[PDB]
């Protein structure tokens, strides 16, 4: 159903069954599929295609030539009714593509809230993007990629399938990420390697002096101690008993499947 | 002429002279030029521009914001009636661009069948793409490039003008190809260098144990023997008398103009 306070441009095509929330705006030449839900205050500027089983939250700004909920590029995908979920207050820029999940990959592509997805950013099938992330121009996530809260993917950077980009990570522009990136790490290059803790990011996001020091100590245990990851895992958990921000490493290790960038 | 069984959306603009085949589907806000031929069962999802002297085969799926047959980016091009040919069962994804040929380059851009051209892949003037190829997101072919059968171009990879990508090649993502890539080779980097035979690709495509071994032996003659290409050409032809798959090297050498990646 289309809320009486929603605006639907006369040139837009909203298929019967679509749900458009209060004060939403569907701009000229937009196409909205019958299984789409558009939340309150969300704006589709113009020339936007939204289809598939897709739920979009509130106060999103979706710019021209974006494709949200489209059939993914997985050669195994065969038209199964997979899904996309997008949260609130995202800025989804020109030509961004967000594709639906695969049955084999869990059936869902998810994007959280307050993200900025710059021109031609790509979110493949079965990806999970958290909150307050930034994908810079042409940043490309392959299938099944996780981008955790506050992580930044630089311009023209690709992330290999199944890789996890930890919370508060900064991946430099013109990079290729082939393994998992622990939280709070700066990564750069092709293949991307670690270049210390994202100190400026942590400072700006209210992390204490003591928390940043403990995170640097955890980074040193992983990358500078010369010990294996298995030897270092209880050392990091021990450190986390005093500085809870260090628990993000433990949580990340349990999810990691591709090894760590080194 | 528009076949009586073709669907043309009322918002689509199909110019008089265009030929639309049986059970084809021209989606909303598509533009089809007067010199375009769209084969039986081909679908233009929405917001697709097809123009120029362009022939598209059967059962193609062309996604929103794609531009097929458009004026090329060659500064020497001056509006001459050059062409595009696209075969059957291709999946041409969002924002892909396929440009018409140049008179100087032979007048034709050609794409075969069963290809997957991922988001924002670019096929410049006078390119020739074979069958069962994959161009990953943002893969960019400069003018006069050849991409032979089953070749894979990774994400964000550029191929320099006039270069040939041999059959069954795999070019890694985030690469720059500046010279010719012999068939069956893995290439990666900027400028791309060879990293052995694409064994997994050959296995998956039904090549015998004996054929893969002979191809590896031919690779060793080119890259590990320490001999010049001229010394090695009769050695490869000799090997091909027993293993016909090795003839692909001989055929490639005759077409090669940029030297080999090394």
């Amino acid at each position: 159903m289309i809320d009486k306070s929603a605006f639907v441009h006369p040139t837009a095509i909203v298929e019967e069954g679509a749900s458009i929330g209060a004060n939403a705006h569907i701009g000229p030449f937009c196409i909205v599929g019958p299984h789409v839900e558009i939340g309150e205050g969300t704006v589709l500027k113009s020339h936007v295609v939204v289809n598939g089983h897709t739920k979009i939250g509130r106060d999103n700004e979706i710019y021209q030539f974006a494709s949200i909920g489209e059939v993914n590029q997985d050669l195994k995908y065969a038209g199964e009714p997979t899904r996309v979920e997008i949260g609130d207050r995202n800025r989804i820029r020109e030509s961004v593509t967000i594709h639906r999940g695969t049955v084999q990959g869990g059936g869902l592509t998810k994007v959280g809230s307050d993200n900025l997805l710059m021109i031609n950013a790509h979110i493949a099938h079965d990806c999970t993007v958290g909150n307050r992330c930034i994908l810079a121009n042409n940043a490309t996530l392959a299938g099944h990629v996780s981008v955790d809260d506050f992580a930044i993917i630089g311009g023209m950077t690709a992330v290999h399938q199944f890789c996890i980009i930890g919370a508060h990570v900064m991946v430099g522009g013109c990079s290729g990420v082939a393994q998992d990136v622990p939280p709070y790490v700066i990564a750069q290059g092709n293949h991307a390697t670690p270049f210390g803790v994202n100190i400026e990011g942590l400072k700006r996001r209210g992390f204490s002096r003591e928390a940043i020091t403990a995170i640097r100590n955890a980074y040193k245990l992983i990358y500078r101690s010369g010990k294996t990851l298995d030897e270092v895992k209880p050392e990091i958990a021990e450190l986390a008993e005093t500085y809870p921000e260090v628990k993000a490493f433990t949580d990340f290790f349990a999810r990691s499947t591709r090894g760590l960038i080194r | 002429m528009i076949d009586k069984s073709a669907f043309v959306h009322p918002t689509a603009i199909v110019e008089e002279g265009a030929s639309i085949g049986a059970n084809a589907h021209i989606g909303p806000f598509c533009i089809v030029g007067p010199h375009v031929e769209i084969g039986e069962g081909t679908v233009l999802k929405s917001h697709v521009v097809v123009n120029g002297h362009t022939k598209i085969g059967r059962d193609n799926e062309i996604y929103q914001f794609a531009s097929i047959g458009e004026v090329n980016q060659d500064l020497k091009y001056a509006g001459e009636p050059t062409r595009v040919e696209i075969g059957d069962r291709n999946r041409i994804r969002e924002s892909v661009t396929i440009h018409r040929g140049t008179v100087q380059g032979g007048g034709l851009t050609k794409v075969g069948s069963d290809n997957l051209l991922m988001i924002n892949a670019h096929i410049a003037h006078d390119c020739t793409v074979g069958n069962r190829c994959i161009l990953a997101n943002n893969a960019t072919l400069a003018g006069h490039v050849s991409v032979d059968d089953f070749a894979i171009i990774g994400g964000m990879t550029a191929v320099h003008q006039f270069c040939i990508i041999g059959a069954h090649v795999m070019v890694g993502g985030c690469s720059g190809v500046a010279q010719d890539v012999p068939p069956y080779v893995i290439a990666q980097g900027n400028h791309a260098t060879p990293f052995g035979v694409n064994i997994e690709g050959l296995k998956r495509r039904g090549f015998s144990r004996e054929a893969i071994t002979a191809i590896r032996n031919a690779y060793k003659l080119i890259y590990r023997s320490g001999k010049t290409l001229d010394e090695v050409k009769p050695e490869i032809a000799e090997l091909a008398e027993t293993y016909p798959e090795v003839k692909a090297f001989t055929d490639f050498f005759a077409r090669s103009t940029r030297g080999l990646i090394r």
């Binding site: 590029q73 997985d74 490309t140 290999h160 290729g176 293949h191 | 990953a136 171009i153």
Partner: peptide, 6 residues
Amino acid sequence: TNLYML
């Protein structure tokens, strides 16, 4: 989406 990163 497979970016064929090696």
